């Protein structure tokens, strides 16, 4: 990935590591620490820091929200990979490694989500006027996006997907719900925390939506080969369009997420 | 006199009406059906009642407490759905009917559980009218802490990762029972007290009271199971007595308040003490 | 009350008949007409007229909208009972009788729905200045209620119902989509065409939404003997709760629809 | 004009982008999936083009017409979805892909089609901006007449109730084509023309133009079949069919004579393309 985005990501990693200090009882915080970092990195989290600085803010104010977003996603990740006994869900061809048993996994996920709200709630700065309102609003966004009409609808509909037999339209919808809403939530939240106004918030949200959707598509093109560059072109266009109107240094970076910048390393390979 | 039986029916009646309105059927239908199957399956609504009584006790009203009151019932509900799963207590029945995963499959029970947990935060955050934003934020943090790894969830995990011990003293069994249940009950009282505009000392008093009934609820639970926990250690001939002490000290904290206002909480305390189901 | 409701169905029937004339070519109009009337009446159309009067307007001002609602309902009724040849829709317990074959029924359903909108667009009286906005508005309401996130959703989800084995929550949901959305539409349109203000429209809209869900909840009562009055009751309460504010025969002439 | 293909392509492209946005996948998913499967499958998008062309012809702009353009294509799409069904044509393919009901079952295909029909009125009704209410209602009226019992559907019924006889005269065959084809093309041009702000005299011209090109299509299709079951060649032979076709084309263009030539150019070329295509 690009230099800017790996560094934001590392910031979030260091913040999460500082907030989740493995202490007694270790059968509790050990699994909580391991699973937070065992989950894949999500741009919905970095997109939060990014959009905040993009609208004037200091990524630092968007930090609690970025951590919470990663945390809501990590709990979801763990639950999705839970070994289930009744075979109520296709055991996703892609099985992952499991350091701890199901009971510990289930439970920790259950403990990870509230933790994201704890960091948020507790990040309120008294010497800040609108803090309680933005933080309140961000908590509504995150809990909606991690909720039944959000991430959960995507996880649920994901189970009906059948190996190269499901349409691109259906998969795009599953990715929009599973990834899109969280990315949208992340851009939206960082805008909010960064002081933005409503029109920007609505465009960064729309951007997040398209980008997240596009990213989920990329992550499934390795499980259902068919990803016509038409879909990608589609989401890519939709995203950049939303981005229009943010001119600047930082704005340059944002658009990079969606569309990679011209690099010699990518031409040197193919040559 | 204080008619505790009538008071509860009315609170429960009011709480059930708000839960049914807050979780409607909508797409995806199966996820919402599952949430509703366990949330509205009937139950005593002790947690939502503790919440509403604490808010009322300090000066506020039901309407302000209702969203949080439903939120603690929602987390309570997902907590049982998750506990009933095969990888946990592996229960087939609950409240007279088949457990959630039996009716819907494990995948949905897990998902619907996660939905109730998220939506509990959405609800309090967005539907609480009658308290400024920073009061609400604070309530969310209080709920987070009480159900986190320093709370309900912590208790549960210290309980499963020690489901084959033998040196369980009164400090190991105090933690589990102070967390895997006390925590959410405790948190219910706090959200209410803060939402009603309680002053710090009042919130401090109710939190302590909260602690006692919290443990009391746990202890009383172990007695209803058997008729490694308190029953085992000192045996009912002091286990039923321990509950008696707790209730007392619980009711002793309530002395901070006018006896007329505290009657409901004194009542909910006794009911937590002398309940059969 | 029985006569007032009865004259309403009659007024709508006499209007449909005046509007759908069997004529050349009979192969088209013969089945258009037969199917417009072989289809049971729906209270959604009744509720539209009663709501227009309720708010002060003349019954004729809502007559085209009510015929449209009947036609959309009629078209859906026809399409839902089509003999499919691949087992993709379980056949109705009381398999209805078909006079014309599947192809004529399919096409005719496609011809009747637009007939509704033709009636509405055609009912604009150029001498009435408020007509275009209200008709337009009502065309949006009906096309939405009969669309993919309204009735078609209920119709679609209904095929998931397994007799004596689907929860009441799920069944009520199907009725809300399949019948509620349309009754909500009929009352909303009726109020709109009568000149009602936003608050009364919303109230009547919500009443109809509840009332139609109850009503459809009753049709199904045969398939699943579990007519739990608690759900039946919960609905009436939410409903009558919406009539409160309108006080008078209002919260009354309407309740007759819940008897 | 120069580059009629280029003009058809840019127009199909705007339409495709607008169709995609109008009908998103959403709950319930099989219903919307099925709608999209046939709506976004490609196609020349002739009806949407006729609609936009007519609007622009009389001075309007594409954006005002776009919802209606999409609407007529929605209708067209659902008529084909219902047409491929086992009770109808019973086709298994369409563009080298399974027909709609082969993919989602007959039930969904019926409903998904009823949803496109419904949504067409909804979209025009709610999304049309830059035209007064009486004008939107009036085009909702036109759309309705062009697809009902005196249009699209009349054409389909009469055709299915005639594939079992032979005494099919010129008059009967023209009813079927005027209705199963021309009707919706007249819908398209009238919708555009009205939204564009056209006078009744202009709407009527465009009305004849459409009626001529729609009949022109079926006639040239018949000619071509014979070249490389009543048809025009069986009823009046290929020679007279070609003469009918030149006359249809000549009459369509006559209708466009008073508009600005540059704005008319697309429609005229469309007419010639219909008259002289090799396939
Ligand atoms: C979380 C534990 C250990 C027990 C449940 O408490 P309750 O006894 O309050 O159960 P319900 O009444 O809600 O059904
Ligand atoms: C003549 C009728 C009634 C339908 C087919 O027309 P088209 O040949 O325009 O097919 P498409 O390109 O739109 O797919």
Short mmCIF file of N, CA, C and O and ligand atoms in Angstrom, two decimals, chain B residues 42-47 73 76 79-80 94-95 180-181 217-218 221 275 277, ligand 1:
data_model
loop_
_atom_site.label_atom_id
_atom_site.label_comp_id
_atom_site.label_asym_id
_atom_site.label_seq_id
_atom_site.Cartn_x
_atom_site.Cartn_y
_atom_site.Cartn_z
N UNK B 42 -40.80 -12.49 26.84
CA UNK B 42 -41.30 -12.50 28.20
C UNK B 42 -40.11 -12.71 29.10
O UNK B 42 -39.16 -13.40 28.74
N UNK B 43 -40.16 -12.11 30.28
CA UNK B 43 -39.04 -12.17 31.19
C UNK B 43 -39.49 -11.17 32.21
O UNK B 43 -40.49 -10.46 31.97
N UNK B 44 -38.76 -11.08 33.31
CA UNK B 44 -39.16 -10.18 34.38
C UNK B 44 -38.86 -8.70 34.17
O UNK B 44 -39.46 -7.90 34.82
N UNK B 45 -37.91 -8.36 33.30
CA UNK B 45 -37.52 -6.96 32.98
C UNK B 45 -37.00 -6.22 34.19
O UNK B 45 -37.26 -5.00 34.36
N UNK B 46 -36.31 -6.96 35.05
CA UNK B 46 -35.68 -6.45 36.26
C UNK B 46 -34.63 -5.32 35.93
O UNK B 46 -34.60 -4.26 36.59
N UNK B 47 -33.81 -5.55 34.92
CA UNK B 47 -32.79 -4.60 34.54
C UNK B 47 -33.46 -3.31 34.03
O UNK B 47 -33.13 -2.22 34.47
N UNK B 73 -31.99 -4.22 28.46
CA UNK B 73 -32.74 -5.43 28.26
C UNK B 73 -32.27 -6.06 26.97
O UNK B 73 -32.27 -7.28 26.87
N UNK B 76 -28.96 -7.64 27.73
CA UNK B 76 -29.25 -8.80 28.57
C UNK B 76 -29.71 -9.94 27.68
O UNK B 76 -29.26 -11.07 27.84
N UNK B 79 -26.99 -11.58 25.49
CA UNK B 79 -26.12 -12.23 26.41
C UNK B 79 -26.65 -13.66 26.64
O UNK B 79 -25.89 -14.61 26.68
N UNK B 80 -27.95 -13.81 26.79
CA UNK B 80 -28.51 -15.14 26.98
C UNK B 80 -28.47 -15.99 25.68
O UNK B 80 -28.20 -17.19 25.72
N UNK B 94 -35.55 -22.32 26.72
CA UNK B 94 -35.39 -21.14 27.58
C UNK B 94 -36.61 -20.23 27.62
O UNK B 94 -36.89 -19.49 26.66
N UNK B 95 -37.31 -20.23 28.76
CA UNK B 95 -38.51 -19.40 28.88
C UNK B 95 -39.60 -20.30 28.32
O UNK B 95 -40.56 -19.82 27.72
N UNK B 180 -20.18 -11.62 35.56
CA UNK B 180 -21.08 -12.40 34.70
C UNK B 180 -22.56 -12.26 35.11
O UNK B 180 -23.35 -13.23 35.05
N UNK B 181 -22.94 -11.03 35.48
CA UNK B 181 -24.30 -10.73 35.90
C UNK B 181 -24.39 -9.50 36.78
O UNK B 181 -25.15 -8.59 36.52
N UNK B 217 -28.17 -10.80 43.20
CA UNK B 217 -28.84 -11.43 42.05
C UNK B 217 -28.05 -12.68 41.65
O UNK B 217 -28.65 -13.73 41.39
N UNK B 218 -26.73 -12.56 41.64
CA UNK B 218 -25.90 -13.70 41.29
C UNK B 218 -26.08 -14.90 42.25
O UNK B 218 -26.27 -16.05 41.82
N UNK B 221 -29.34 -16.50 42.10
CA UNK B 221 -29.45 -17.28 40.88
C UNK B 221 -28.94 -18.71 41.15
O UNK B 221 -29.61 -19.69 40.83
N UNK B 275 -37.51 -14.15 44.76
CA UNK B 275 -38.18 -14.49 43.51
C UNK B 275 -38.10 -16.00 43.36
O UNK B 275 -37.25 -16.63 43.99
N UNK B 277 -38.59 -17.56 40.03
CA UNK B 277 -38.10 -17.80 38.66
C UNK B 277 -37.18 -16.66 38.22
O UNK B 277 -36.97 -15.71 39.01
C1 LIG E 1 -27.34 -13.39 33.06
C2 LIG E 1 -27.80 -14.51 34.06
C3 LIG E 1 -26.78 -15.38 34.77
C4 LIG E 1 -29.11 -14.79 34.35
C5 LIG E 1 -30.33 -14.11 33.78
O1 LIG E 1 -31.08 -13.21 34.62
P1 LIG E 1 -32.69 -13.23 34.46
O2 LIG E 1 -33.18 -14.27 35.52
O3 LIG E 1 -32.98 -11.73 34.63
O4 LIG E 1 -33.42 -13.79 33.16
P2 LIG E 1 -34.78 -13.21 32.53
O5 LIG E 1 -35.80 -13.02 33.60
O6 LIG E 1 -34.70 -11.98 31.67
O7 LIG E 1 -35.49 -14.13 31.50
#
